[PDB]
A = this chain, B = another copy of it.
Amino acid sequence: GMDDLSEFVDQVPLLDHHCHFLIDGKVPNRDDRLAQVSTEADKDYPLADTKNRLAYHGFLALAKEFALDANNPLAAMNDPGYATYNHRIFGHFHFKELLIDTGFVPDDPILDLDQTAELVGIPVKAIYRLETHAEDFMLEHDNFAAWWQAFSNDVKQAKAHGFVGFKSIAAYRVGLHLEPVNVIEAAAGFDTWKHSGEKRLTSKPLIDYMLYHVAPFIIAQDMPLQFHVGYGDADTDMYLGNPLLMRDYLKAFTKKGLKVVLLHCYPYHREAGYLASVFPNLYFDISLLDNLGPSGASRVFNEAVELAPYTRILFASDASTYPEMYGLAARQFKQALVAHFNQLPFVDLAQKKAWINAICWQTSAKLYHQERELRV
């Protein structure tokens, strides 16, 4: 029937399965940095226009709500104050763990995960970004075979090195129409890349080869593989970000045990939820939409779960830089859950609570093997 889940959802812990480094709290232009991170627009896009989106105003609202000094709510913060401030936000929303994709580095970063864990008050683990590791290995080798040996060995060693999952940014570089590639074309892609002088990996033949060939390595370590899907920057071709384009890859590997996680998804969240309903081992979130498109979080959540199992959708923030972005994601997502489940037909209160727990922390705890961190 009709329930009131607000108080329950207030206390539900969050395992943020995909997010990003924070920056140094002492950085002076905090208001502008908040504005800049509130959008995927680039540095040339007018800041005044960014400030006329709702996300920025959500960030300001949270800054005011949790401010150390109500009279100087946008002040830079020294280390004790910044830790206090982070603790207030992460604690308010009951975040219990962050899994950080360490391949994105914001300006003035806090890179150390132990320092991040001290700052926010909860455990923080790393996700291995494939393409950035591929780039760094490229610089050390002049031929495909030696590069591939070194890179693939690094991928195979990720679990041993303390990573808890993997990430591909293919959608930002080449799109998601993943198809198998012969080693001839992959190696030609490598050579073209090497000779171009550009560090950035943008070769579709080489990225697609890499993704097909690392899948067994990832399955053997039994850790998830995340993909960015949808919502990107002006250099992302969003037309190629429709996750239906991944069907051949999903057919190839999900039945073999590859756990694939579709990040963000918007505007293709119905497609992602559909895919979750027909493929094994396929999970998704509405991160980035949930904080940077805050008025859409409830309707997007609802649309996202029309066909999906509730045990396949995950909480993530996709947040970087400042705790407001984490907080806003949490607030909008938790509001969406209450609005969705309060009037949901057919199921009892206990089932509603079981599904909310799954989405917020429990599915990710299982998927990423983080059960211990989520113990009460």
Contacts and interface: CB of A to CB of B under 8 A. Distances in A.
Interface string A317-340: 000000000000000000000000
Contacts of A344: 54, 295
A267 interface: yes
A50 B299 contact: no
Interface in A215-268: 231, 233-234, 237-239, 242, 244-245, 247, 250-251, 255, 267
A39 interface: yes
A278 B41 contact: yes
What's the interface size class on A, roughly?
Answer: 35 or more
Given A234-B251, A345-B61, A306 B293 contact: yes
Interface stretch (A125-133, A179-187, A307-315): A307-315
Contacts of A295: 302, 305-306, 344-345
Given A52-B309, A294-B345, A267 B277 contact: no
Given A292-B307, A346-B60, A267 B271 contact: yes
Residue from A49, A302, A303 whose CB has the most chain B CB atoms within 10 Å: A49
Interface of A: 39-42, 44-46, 49-50, 52-54, 57-58, 60-61, 231, 233-234, 237-239, 242, 244-245, 247, 250-251, 255, 267, 270-271, 274, 277-280, 289, 292-296, 299-300, 302-303, 305-312, 344-347, 351, 355, 358
